[PDB]
From Swiss-Prot:
Protein name: Filamin-A
Free-text domain note: Comprised of a NH2-terminal actin-binding domain, 24 immunoglobulin-like internally homologous repeats and two hinge regions. Repeat 24 and the second hinge domain are important for dimer formation. Filamin repeat 20 interacts with filamin repeat 21 masking the ligand binding site on filamin repeat 21, resulting in an autoinhibited conformation. The autoinhibition can be relieved by ligands like ITGB7 or FBLIM1. Filamin repeats 19 and 21 can simultaneously engage ligands.
Protein family membership: Belongs to the filamin family.
Modifications made to the protein after synthesis: Phosphorylation extent changes in response to cell activation.
Phosphoserine: residues carrying this PTM: 61, 104, 106
Tissue: Ubiquitous.
Assembly and binders: Homodimer. Interacts with PDLIM2. Interacts with RFLNA and RFLNB. Interacts with FCGR1A, FLNB, FURIN, HSPB7, INPPL1, KCND2, MYOT, MYOZ1, ARHGAP24, PSEN1, PSEN2 and ECSCR. Also interacts with various other binding partners in addition to filamentous actin. Interacts (via N-terminus) with MIS18BP1 (via N-terminus). Interacts (via N-terminus) with TAF1B. Interacts with TMEM67 (via C-terminus) and MKS1. Interacts (via actin-binding domain) with MICALL2 (via CH domain). Interacts (via filamin repeat 5) with SYK; docks SYK to the plasma membrane.
Function: Promotes orthogonal branching of actin filaments and links actin filaments to membrane glycoproteins. Anchors various transmembrane proteins to the actin cytoskeleton and serves as a scaffold for a wide range of cytoplasmic signaling proteins. Interaction with FLNB may allow neuroblast migration from the ventricular zone into the cortical plate. Tethers cell surface-localized furin, modulates its rate of internalization and directs its intracellular trafficking. Involved in ciliogenesis.
Cell compartment(s), UniProt: Cytoplasm, Cell cortex; Cytoplasm, Cytoskeleton; Perikaryon; Cell projection, Growth cone
Length: 106
């Protein structure tokens, strides 16, 4: 039940200063890597933990960025609502449990 795919990646003012957004957190396509970005400007780095909870398996891929920005892309194997629970340095951030409506690309 839930926690279909999760990832804890260390990042090399607090979690309340960290908010997540991007296409990947507003909509997702079944069988497509939905990429979202986490606002880690005023944070101080630490550890980015992400758990994708949904009806089916999700493919979480983590890619780094030269500026030191965060970019996470996850697929979904089947359409539905997906609640991505994030944690920055063990903190669930303000409003992490983002439910992303995954729909069929077709």
């Amino acid at each position: 039940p839930l926690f279909k795919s999760a990832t804890t990646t260390v990042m090399n003012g607090g979690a309340h200063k960290v908010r997540a957004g991007g296409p990947g957190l507003e909509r997702a396509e079944a069988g497509v890597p939905a990429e979202f970005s986490i606002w880690t400007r005023e944070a101080g780095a630490g550890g980015l933990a992400i758990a994708v909870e949904g009806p089916s398996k999700a493919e979480i891929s983590f890619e780094d960025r030269k500026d030191g920005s965060c970019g996470v892309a996850y697929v979904v194997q089947e359409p539905g609502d997906y609640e991505v629970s994030v944690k920055f340095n063990e903190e669930h951030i303000p409003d992490s449990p983002f439910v992303v409506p995954v729909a069929s690309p077709s």
